[PDB]
Amino acid sequence: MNIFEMLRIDEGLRLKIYKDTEGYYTIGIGHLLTKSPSLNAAKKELDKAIGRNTNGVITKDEAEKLFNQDVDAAVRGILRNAKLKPVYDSLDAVRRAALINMVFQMGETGVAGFTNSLRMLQQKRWDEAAVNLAKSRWYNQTPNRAKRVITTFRTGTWDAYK
Numbered sequence: 733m734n735i736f737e738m739l740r741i742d743e744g745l746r747l748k749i750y751k752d753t754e755g756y757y758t759i760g761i762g763h764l765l766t767k768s769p770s771l772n773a774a775k776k777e778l779d780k781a782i783g784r785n786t787n788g789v790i791t792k793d794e795a796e797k798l799f800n801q802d803v804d805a806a807v808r809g810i811l812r813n814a815k816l817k818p819v820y821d822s823l824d825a826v827r828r829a830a831l832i833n834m835v836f837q838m839g840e841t842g843v844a845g846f847t848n849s850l851r852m853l854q855q856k857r858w859d860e861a862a863v864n865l866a867k868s869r870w871y872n873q874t875p876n877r878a879k880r881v882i883t884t885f886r887t888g889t890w891d892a893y894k
């Protein structure tokens with residue numbers, strides 16, 4: 733299993749603009765287009781992202797291209813972050829993927845807000861980090877995905893995704 737296959741399980745793949753779990757216009761493999769309620773503002777962000785007039789539809793290649801870009805940015809974003817980088821550096825390969833996942837979903841700011849849980853991950857207190865991670869709007873809004881990510885943090889294996 734790898735980061736790409738893990739996020740592809742968490743986000744699915746859709747080739748037409750859709751609304752995410754929060755009601756925002758998205759396309760592809762969890763690629764947020766905009767928070768505006770305007771569908772037209774979404775189609776425009778899309779064309780700009782793809783460099784062609786799509787009319788709200790993209791191909792599998794176009795979806796994967798945005799995905800590659802998004803994973804890369806999530807990683808680069810964690811490495812540029814004074815609060816996230818140290819955590820990431822402290823973790824093993826599997827758990828590093830769990831952190832990329834949270835950042836891909838909620839952005840670097842959001843994750844940097846998990847202050848206490850980050851400190852626990854760093855100290856390798858797995859059970860206690862998992863309990864804290866669960867006391868969050870994140871967990872209450874997207875419980876099945878949160879549980880998978882949390883179990884990944886707790887065990888250091890891909891069991892939740894297998």
Ligand SMILES: [Cl-]
Nearest residue numbers: 780781798801
């Ligand atoms: Cl983009």
Ligand SMILES: [Cl-]
Nearest residue numbers: 874875876877
């Ligand atoms: Cl969920």
